Amino acid sequence: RHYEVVLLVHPDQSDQVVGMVERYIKLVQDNNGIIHRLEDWGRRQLAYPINKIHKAHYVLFNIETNGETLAELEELFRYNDAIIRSLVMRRDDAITEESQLA
Amino acid sequence: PIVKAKPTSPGRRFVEKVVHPHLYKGRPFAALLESKSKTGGRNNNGRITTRHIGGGHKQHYRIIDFKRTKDNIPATVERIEYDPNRTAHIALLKYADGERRYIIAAKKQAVGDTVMSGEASPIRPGNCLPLKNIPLGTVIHNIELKIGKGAQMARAAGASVQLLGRDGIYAILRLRSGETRRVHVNCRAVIGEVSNTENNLKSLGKAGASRWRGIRPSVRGVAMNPVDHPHGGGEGRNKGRHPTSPWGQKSKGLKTRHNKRTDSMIIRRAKK
Amino acid sequence: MLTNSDREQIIAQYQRGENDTGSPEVQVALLSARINDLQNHFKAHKADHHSRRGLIRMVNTRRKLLDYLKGKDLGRYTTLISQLGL
Amino acid sequence: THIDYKDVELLKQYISENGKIVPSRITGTSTKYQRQLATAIKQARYLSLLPYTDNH
RNA sequence: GAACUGCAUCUGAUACUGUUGAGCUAGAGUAUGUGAGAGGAAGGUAGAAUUCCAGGUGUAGCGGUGAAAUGCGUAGAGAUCUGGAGGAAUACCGAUGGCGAAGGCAGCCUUCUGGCAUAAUACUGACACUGAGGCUCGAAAGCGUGGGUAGCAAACAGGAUUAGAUACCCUGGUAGUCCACGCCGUAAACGAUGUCUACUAGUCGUUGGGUCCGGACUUAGUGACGCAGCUAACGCAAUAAGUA
RNA sequence: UUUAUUAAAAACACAGCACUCUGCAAACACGAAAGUGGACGUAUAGGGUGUGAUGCCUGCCCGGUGCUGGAAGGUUAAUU
Numbered sequence: 102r103h104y105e106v107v108l109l110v111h112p113d114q115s116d117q118v119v120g121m122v123e124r125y126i127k128l129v130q131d132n133n134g135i136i137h138r139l140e141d142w143g144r145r146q147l148a149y150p151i152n153k154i155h156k157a158h159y160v161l162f163n164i165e166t167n168g169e170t171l172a173e174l175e176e177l178f179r180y181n182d183a184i185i186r187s188l189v190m191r192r193d194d195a196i197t198e199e200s201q202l203a
Numbered sequence: 204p205i206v207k208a209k210p211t212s213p214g215r216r217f218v219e220k221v222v223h224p225h226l227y228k229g230r231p232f233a234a235l236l237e238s239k240s241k242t243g244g245r246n247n248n249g250r251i252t253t254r255h256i257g258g259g260h261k262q263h264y265r266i267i268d269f270k271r272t273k274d275n276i277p278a279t280v281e282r283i284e285y286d287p288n289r290t291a292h293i294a295l296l297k298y299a300d301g302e303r304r305y306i307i308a309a310k311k312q313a314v315g316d317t318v319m320s321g322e323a324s325p326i327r328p329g330n331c332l333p334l335k336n337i338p339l340g341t342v343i344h345n346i347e348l349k350i351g352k353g354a355q356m357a358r359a360a361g362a363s364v365q366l367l368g369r370d371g372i373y374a375i376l377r378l379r380s381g382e383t384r385r386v387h388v389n390c391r392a393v394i395g396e397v398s399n400t401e402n403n404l405k406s407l408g409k410a411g412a413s414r415w416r417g418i419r420p421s422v423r424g425v426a427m428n429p430v431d432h433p434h435g436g437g438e439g440r441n442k443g444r445h446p447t448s449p450w451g452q453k454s455k456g457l458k459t460r461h462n463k464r465t466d467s468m469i470i471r472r473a474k475k
Numbered sequence: 476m477l478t479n480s481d482r483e484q485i486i487a488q489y490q491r492g493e494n495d496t497g498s499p500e501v502q503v504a505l506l507s508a509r510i511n512d513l514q515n516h517f518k519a520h521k522a523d524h525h526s527r528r529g530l531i532r533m534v535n536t537r538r539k540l541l542d543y544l545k546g547k548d549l550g551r552y553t554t555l556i557s558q559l560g561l
Numbered sequence: 562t563h564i565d566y567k568d569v570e571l572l573k574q575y576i577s578e579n580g581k582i583v584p585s586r587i588t589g590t591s592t593k594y595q596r597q598l599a600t601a602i603k604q605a606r607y608l609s610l611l612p613y614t615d616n617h
Numbered sequence: 618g619a620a621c622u623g624c625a626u627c628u629g630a631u632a633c634u635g636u637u638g639a640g641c642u643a644g645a646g647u648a649u650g651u652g653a654g655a656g657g658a659a660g661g662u663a664g665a666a667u668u669c670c671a672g673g674u675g676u677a678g679c680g681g682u683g684a685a686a687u688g689c690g691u692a693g694a695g696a697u698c699u700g701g702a703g704g705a706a707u708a709c710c711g712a713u714g715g716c717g718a719a720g721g722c723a724g725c726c727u728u729c730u731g732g733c734a735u736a737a738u739a740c741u742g743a744c745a746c747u748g749a750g751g752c753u754c755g756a757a758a759g760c761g762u763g764g765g766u767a768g769c770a771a772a773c774a775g776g777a778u779u780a781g782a783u784a785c786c787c788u789g790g791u792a793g794u795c796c797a798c799g800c801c802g803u804a805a806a807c808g809a810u811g812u813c814u815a816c817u818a819g820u821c822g823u824u825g826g827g828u829c830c831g832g833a834c835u836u837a838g839u840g841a842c843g844c845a846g847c848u849a850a851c852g853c854a855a856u857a858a859g860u861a
Numbered sequence: 862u863u864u865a866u867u868a869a870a871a872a873c874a875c876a877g878c879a880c881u882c883u884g885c886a887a888a889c890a891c892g893a894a895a896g897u898g899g900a901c902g903u904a905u906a907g908g909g910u911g912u913g914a915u916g917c918c919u920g921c922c923c924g925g926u927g928c929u930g931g932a933a934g935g936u937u938a939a940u941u
Contacts, residue, residue, distance in 0.1 A: 104727090107608060147609040149617040149664080157609075161567075168728075175661090175727085180326070180338055186663090188608055189727065202567050217876060217914065239901085245891090246898035252890040253899045253908085264901070290905065346903095348885075354903090355885060361905045367702090380904045382884060383702095403905035404763080408914095410875040420862085420874050423911070434910085445927050446881090446910045450890080454909040455881055456928040459888055469884075471670085474930095475766095476730085479649085486648070496648040497740035505647075516658090516730055524754060525657035525717075529731040531753080536646080543744040582710040592714065592824065593653080599710045600725085606664075607725055613664050614708095692933045773921095 103137070103165045103195050108178065109151070109186030110158040112144060118158050121181065125162070125174060134166035137195045140203045151185050163196050205404050218408030221401055223292070225314075227282040232295055235305055237264040239288075241417065259417025262287035268296075268304040269345065269353035271331035271391065274321030276300060280314050280329070283398070290360035292398040294318075294329070307345055307358060309395035328395030334366070334374040335388040341366050344397045346376065347390035354391070360399035364392070381473035424449060477512055499544040500555055506537040507559050564594060566601035569610050576602060579615040 110118050122139070129136055142159035151157065166174070171189070178187040210216035244256030265286050278296035281303070286293045294308035296318060306318070309328035318329035322336050337343060342363045345354030356378065357364045365377040373385040407413055410420075424434030425442055432449045434442060446454045482505065486496050489504040513530050517523060541561070545552035555561075564571070575590075575598055577583050582602055585595045605611040 109608065145610075148606075148612040149609055151609060171727085179661095182338070186608065188604070188725090190604075191727070200567050201565075202569070213914085214876085237901085242898065242900090244898065247896065248891050248898090250891045250898085252897080254890085256899085266901090288900095289902070346884095356903065358903050359906050362903085378884065378904075380884065382904090384884065397905090400905075405905095407876055413876070422873070424909090425911075426873065442911080448889085448909050450909095452889085452909075453881095453928075454911090457882075458929080459882055459908095460884090462885095462887085465884080465886090482648080492740080494648085495740045497646075497742085499741070499744075502647055502741080502744095513730080520658045520729065523658045523730065526729090526731040528657090528718080528754080532732090540646085540741095540744065547742095547744080577709080579709095581708080584710070585712075592712075595710075595712090596654090596715095602710080603663095603725055607662085609663095617664085692931075 102167065102171075103163070103192040104171060105138075105161065105163045105190045105192050105196065106174070106178075107186075107188040108160045108162075108184050109188075110160065110183050111185055112154060112156050112158060114183040115144065115158045117183065118160060121183065122160060122162070125177065128173065128177070129164050129166050129170060132166060132170040134164060134170055135195075136162060136164050137197050138163035138200075140200055142202045154185075157185060159202070161200065161202075163192070165195060205401055208408070214409035214411070216408070217406050218412070219404070219406035221399070221405045223285075223399070225283065226292060227284045227295075231263065231265055231284055232303055232305070235266045235303065237266060239264040255419045255421050256417060257419045258414055260287070260415060264288055265293060265305050267293065268306050269355075269358075270351070271306070271320040271354075271393070273298060273302070273304070275319075275323070277317050277319055278304070279317055280308075280312060282314055283308050283312070289358070290399060290402045291358065291362075292360075307354070307393070308398040309344065309393065310361075310398045310400055311395055312398065326394055329393060331391050331393045333389055333391050334386060337366055337392060337394070339366055339368055341394060342396055343392040343394055345391075345393040346386060347392065348386065350387055350389045354393070357397065359397065360402035361397055363396035366392075375470060381475070383470035383472070385468045385470065477508055481508070499540045499547075500551065503537050503540050503544070503555060504559060506533050506540075507561070509533060510537070564597050564601055566604040566608070566610070568601070569605060572598070572602055572605055572611060576611060580606075580612045 110121075118141075122141075126136055126139070139162045140160070142161065144156050145159045146156050147154070164174075175187075175189065178184050204222060205219050206222045208215045208218040208220070239262065241259065241261075242256065244251050244253035246252045265284075265288060276298050278298045281295040281297045284293050284295060284305075286305075289307075292308040293305045294312060296304045296306055298304070306329070311328040312318075316327075316329070318327075318331075319325065320331040322333055324330040324332050324336075326332075326338065326341060331345070334343075343366055344357040344362050344364060346356035346364055347353060348355050362379060364379070367375045367377055367383065369375065369388065370385070372388050374388050374390075375383060376386055377383050424432035424447075425437075425440070427435035429436035433444060433447050433451055437443065448454055452459070485504050485508050486501050489498075489501040490496075491498045491500055495501065510530065510533055513526075513533075517527060517530065520526070541552065541556065544555065566572070575583055575588060582599055585592070588595075590598065602611060606613050
């Protein structure tokens with residue numbers, strides 16, 4: 102099952118935004134999952150403030166995994182507390198083309 | 204769950220018993236047991252200081268680990284036992300070194316799963332963590348009040364606490380009393396609500412069942428003579444006076460808390 | 476659900492002829508597999524009446540095909556229900 | 562051809578000045594693509610790529 | 618005499634019905650690919666807004682009405698700014714639009730899951746329709762138990778209006794509305810139109826497909842008209858209330 | 862269950878219901894205090910009060926007296 106997950110991380114943790122990305126990569130790939138796309142939209146300006154901040158780091162990684170690793174990933178996103186938003190969508194196929202936001 | 208008895212006797216017509224097939228049918232772990240004689244509600248003067256206590260079944264004390272200081276050594280849940288000393292179920296923990304303890308069992312805690320104590324523990328039911336390491340909004344139980352003393356709050360069956368937030372070295376907890384209060388962030392808590400959530404759905408059925416639990420009958424003040432109780436007296440039924448205890452303290456609405464040294468720990472209470 | 480692979484496994488097991496996939500045997504076997512698999516869904520979702528409507532229709536269709544097959548050839552019907560535990 | 566929620570620059574000309582979705586009787590879009598556009602706009606609003614209203 | 622439409626038993630016929638053997642694919646289904654959808658169930662989450670709590674600014678009104686008054690406010694309201702709590706609903710999109718057997722179903726995401734629509738090929742070979750009883754589901758209100766409780770609001774309290782006003786209007790306000798699990802089994806539960814077939818001028822929209830050359834044809838819906846026909850009339854008219 | 866020894870009951874208790882208190886060194890109770898009971902319990906717990914299985918239910922009144930909250934103003938102790 103292919104999933105497209107967009108993470109929305111605090112600007113105060115943009116330095117560790119890379120480390121958490123590789124941690125999630127390792128978790129996905131250690132469960133025989135595939136990581137098809139990994140972009141980094143950088144410090145985007147929010148259209149409305151989230152938790153009092155106006156700028157935040159966007160990272161979209163189109164991964165391919167199973168339900169159990171998806172649950173593990175979702176719990177990690179819930180408990181990270183550096184991620185202020187997460188959008189996990191399901192895709193019928195795998196997307197590798199460069200997105201319009203990068 | 205709750206099982207009604209058939210009305211095959213008038214003393215059975217309203218018995219609704221709490222039934223748990225999944226809890227141990229055998230005897231408790233003998234090394235964690237202490238003798239405990241009944242008190243009759245009498246203090247060291249031999250005086251009744253707490254009324255309606257007496258009789259009931261002999262029961263041992265199960266030594267409960269309320270402190271959970273075997274940190275970083277995993278334990279497996281050997282069994283879930285009935286405890287006559289509380290309304291919650293207890294879990295026999297078997298540590299990696301082989302030491303066995305009893306803890307309060309969480310609702311989502313089954314035989315076989317692994318529990319952890321310390322600060323680097325997963326947020327799973329039965330794990331004991333300092334309140335600074337528990338994410339906000341997690342449902343917790345067995346709250347420590349003084350650092351290192353052991354759990355005192357949210358221990359009864361079904362007991363849960365909302366971990367609302369933080370201000371400095373304090374965690375803000377909403378208790379099931381409708382009370383929001385501060386607790387030091389170094390105090391510990393256990394993840395999840397407490398087992399035996401349907402404890403309060405039970406119906407004893409008959410007077411003898413209350414006697415089995417060591418409770419003596421209760422005689423209303425209005426049924427006495429005035430020499431026994433402020434409500435005593437009267438030709439026929441009559442109250443006459445504002446409701447009050449036998450010692451003359453009013454019992455409808457009058458507040459009785461008097462503790463200034465802890466008054467700063469309490470954010471607020473709820474109104475309903 | 477049932478995957479394409481296990482659906483084809485059931486089809487192959489109950490083929491009366493080559494790649495028929497339409498006889499009462501294969502139809503009843505596929506319906507039986509789908510019902511036994513949907514039991515898992517309806518044990519966790521008891522109030523799913525809109526899905527239960529379709530499952531009941533599956534049961535009705537299997538009953539119609541079993542009665543038709545019994546009236547057609549009784550040996551085939553008694554063999555099929557013995558294989559499927561019905 | 563196709564429409565996604567990461568086409569924010571495309572979604573801008575289908576959102577109003579105050580963040581409201583513009584109706585089909587104005588834009589002229591088909592029912593199917595209008596449904597997809599509404600879904601993508603709602604997703605972008607969640608991801609804070611577009612504003613819900615113009616006064617948050 | 619005729620009749621006694623009747624019954625019985627033999628004989629003959631096989632068009633139809635009944636019972637049977639074999640075969641067929643056009644009704645009904647299966648496998649395979651795509652597609653649309655507020656279909657259902659369980660979780661999570663977002664943003665606007667209300668209410669409340671606590672502060673800053675500030676001062677004499679606010680609120681409400683046809684006018685008023687009750688109410689709130691000098692113990693500092695209302696307004697404005699900043700924080701916090703909580704519940705409920707999901708603006709725009711939005712559409713005689715869609716999905717569902719009806720009842721119904723709208724933020725977004727995931728998980729489980731039903732039906733439908735569509736192309737071609739292969740397959741089964743009448744497996745069909747309807748259906749007394751029976752069962753299932755079934756708005757809202759209501760009921761039981763346990764939660765929750767912002768807004769709204771039966772009851773209720775007050776203020777008006779009035780001859781009166783157990784109302785309409787105003788200020789409040791509890792059940793209920795929300796959740797879980799069970800009842801209840803009723804609605805102008807309506808298209809006041811049972812289900813399923815086939816056939817019968819046409820014209821213009823629209824939703825989901827398909828095939829051709831921006832159009833044309835065809836499909837399953839969903840609408841507006843309009844012949845024949847039908848109707849007491851109104852009207853219905855391929856989504857019949859026509860012909861069976 | 863009860864008036865041992867003139868009253869056994871419709872009285873008391875009772876399972877159940879409700880209100881209210883109590884965040885733990887709990888409230889509450891014994892005690893001069895230490896020390897205790899509550900309880901090696903922890904708000905699904907513990908105390909007080911009323912009512913008394915269950916079924917259907919439980920209307921109106923906050924003027925009085927209590928209780929809860931509030932503090933603008935009036936009055937007000939020792940002290941100075």
